[PDB]
Amino acid sequence: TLNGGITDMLTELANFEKNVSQAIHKYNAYRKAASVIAKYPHKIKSGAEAKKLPGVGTKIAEKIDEFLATGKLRKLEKIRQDDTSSSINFLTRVSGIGPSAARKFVDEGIKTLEDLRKNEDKLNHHQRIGLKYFGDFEKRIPREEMLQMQDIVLNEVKKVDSEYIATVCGSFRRGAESSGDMDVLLTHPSFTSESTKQPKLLHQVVEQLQKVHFITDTLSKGETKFMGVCQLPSKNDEKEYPHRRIDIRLIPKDQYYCGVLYFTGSDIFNKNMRAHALEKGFTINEYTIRPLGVTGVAGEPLPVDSEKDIFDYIQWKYREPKDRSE
DNA sequence: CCGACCGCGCATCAGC
DNA sequence: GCTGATGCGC
DNA sequence: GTCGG
Numbered sequence: 001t002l003n004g005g006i007t008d009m010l011t012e013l014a015n016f017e018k019n020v021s022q023a024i025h026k027y028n029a030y031r032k033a034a035s036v037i038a039k040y041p042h043k044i045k046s047g048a049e050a051k052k053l054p055g056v057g058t059k060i061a062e063k064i065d066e067f068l069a070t071g072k073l074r075k076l077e078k079i080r081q082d083d084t085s086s087s088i089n090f091l092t093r094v095s096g097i098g099p100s101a102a103r104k105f106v107d108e109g110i111k112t113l114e115d116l117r118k119n120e121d122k123l124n125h126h127q128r129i130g131l132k133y134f135g136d137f138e139k140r141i142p143r144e145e146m147l148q149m150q151d152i153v154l155n156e157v158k159k160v161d162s163e164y165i166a167t168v169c170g171s172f173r174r175g176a177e178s179s180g181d182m183d184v185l186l187t188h189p190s191f192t193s194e195s196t197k198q199p200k201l202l203h204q205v206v207e208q209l210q211k212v213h214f215i216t217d218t219l220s221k222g223e224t225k226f227m228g229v230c231q232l233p234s235k236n237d238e239k240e241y242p243h244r245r246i247d248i249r250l251i252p253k254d255q256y257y258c259g260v261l262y263f264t265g266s267d268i269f270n271k272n273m274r275a276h277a278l279e280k281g282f283t284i285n286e287y288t289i290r291p292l293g294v295t296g297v298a299g300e301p302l303p304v305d306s307e308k309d310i311f312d313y314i315q316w317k318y319r320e321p322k323d324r325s326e
Numbered sequence: 327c328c329g330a331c332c333g334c335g336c337a338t339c340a341g342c
Numbered sequence: 343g344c345t346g347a348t349g350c351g352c
Numbered sequence: 353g354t355c356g357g
């Protein structure tokens with residue numbers, strides 16, 4: 001919040017470029033600037049001072065000077081006044097509606113929550129579930145609720161097969177006092193990079209969680225990734241908890257560290273780290289870290305026994321989860 | 327200037 | 343059906 | 353929109 005004004009401004013610009021301009025690189029550019037400024041330990045007094053930071057350039061520095069002088073940005077004022085832009089930006093807040101679908105809907109004259117609700121037949125499944133829980137999905141999850149949810153997921157998985165290990169990742173694993181959703185990494189010894197010795201490993205865990213009415217809806221589901229909806233149980237007479245987004249990722253057991261690195265994030269952290277990897281001649285995904293050959297074709301998986309081995313390969317000091325929140 | 331910008335799972339579609 | 347491209351979301 | 357080479 002130290003430079004909250006500026007970071008909010010940059011994020012709104014990022015959002016515009018993603019949702020309206022469908023310009024993903026500008027979106028990332030703005031997001032990177034916002035990240036580096038959020039980290040910066042002084043109240044920025046000028047654009048020039050900000051432009052010192054990597055990711056902040058001439059244009060964002062100009063914008064910062066306007067913001068600091070006036071408390072606002074004319075470019076954003078106009079955007080806010082533009083109906084097409086406002087509408088498109090709104091609709092993308094529904095899970096499953098992205099920039100294109102949003103713009104398509106706005107061409108059909110579907111512009112508001114009302115419109116969506118009276119045109120449910122125009123929505124795919126994910127989008128329908130996103131509309132159903134629109135309000136709920138805007139609420140954050142207090143950590144104390146994540147702890148209750150953790151306890152449920154871990155216990156239920158244990159009942160399915162004691163050899164499963166489920167790890168809560170995302171902002172929770174980074175120590176955040178609230179989270180936008182729950183991310184669960186799962187492993188089981190029978191699923192490795194060498195073999196899938198057992199089918200339905202993810203399905204069985206999903207079934208059990210639906211069985212106990214923890215998972216309530218499914219947005220998408222395959223052999224290794226489940227994306228859906230869950231809800232804590234409430235007590236007699238007590239108002240129900242909001243429905244919450246949940247993602248469960250099943251990773252080969254021997255690839256745990258790359259998997260938990262990926263799923264701990266943050267997303268921007270992962271992008272920065274993978275980019276640095278490339279500069280150092282490696283490529284990192286959720287499975288492996290590999291060298292980039294003479295040509296730039298990935299080579300074979302390097303051995304990894306900890307998260308820190310990954311950092312070591314690319315010549316970064318180890319960062320604890322809590323310091324990966326960029 | 328001028329690319330290159332992380333990397334990938336699932337849903338859905340077009341074209342064969 | 344299949345493969346590939348595109349959208350969306352992590 | 354920013355930056356490295």
Ligand SMILES: Nc1nc2c(ncn2[C@H]2C[C@H](O)[C@@H](COP(=O)(O)OP(=O)(O)[C@H](Cl)P(=O)(O)O)O2)c(=O)[nH]1
Binds near residue numbers: 169170263267
């Ligand atoms: N490489 C990469 N990893 C990503 C990306 N997006 C997400 N991840 C990884 C990194 C990310 O941490 C994890 C879960 O994604 P979620 O969108 O839930 O991010 P949280 O951090 O949990 C977010 Cl602060 P909260 O859920 O609390 O509101 O997936 C991406 O674009 N790229």
Ligand SMILES: [Cl-]
Binds near residue numbers: 022024026
């Ligand atoms: Cl772009």
Ligand SMILES: [Cl-]
Binds near residue numbers: 009071072076077
């Ligand atoms: Cl503003």
Ligand SMILES: [Cl-]
Binds near residue numbers: 259288
């Ligand atoms: Cl690993």
Ligand SMILES: [Cl-]
Binds near residue numbers: 285287288
């Ligand atoms: Cl791989």
Ligand SMILES: [Cl-]
Binds near residue numbers: 174
């Ligand atoms: Cl930590």
Ligand SMILES: [Mg+2]
Binds near residue numbers: 170179180182
């Ligand atoms: Mg999360």
Ligand code: NA
Binds near residue numbers: 051053054056
């Ligand atoms: Na700069």
Ligand code: NA
Binds near residue numbers: 091092094096097
């Ligand atoms: Na959306």
Ligand code: NA
Binds near residue numbers: 170181182183246247
């Ligand atoms: Na998530």
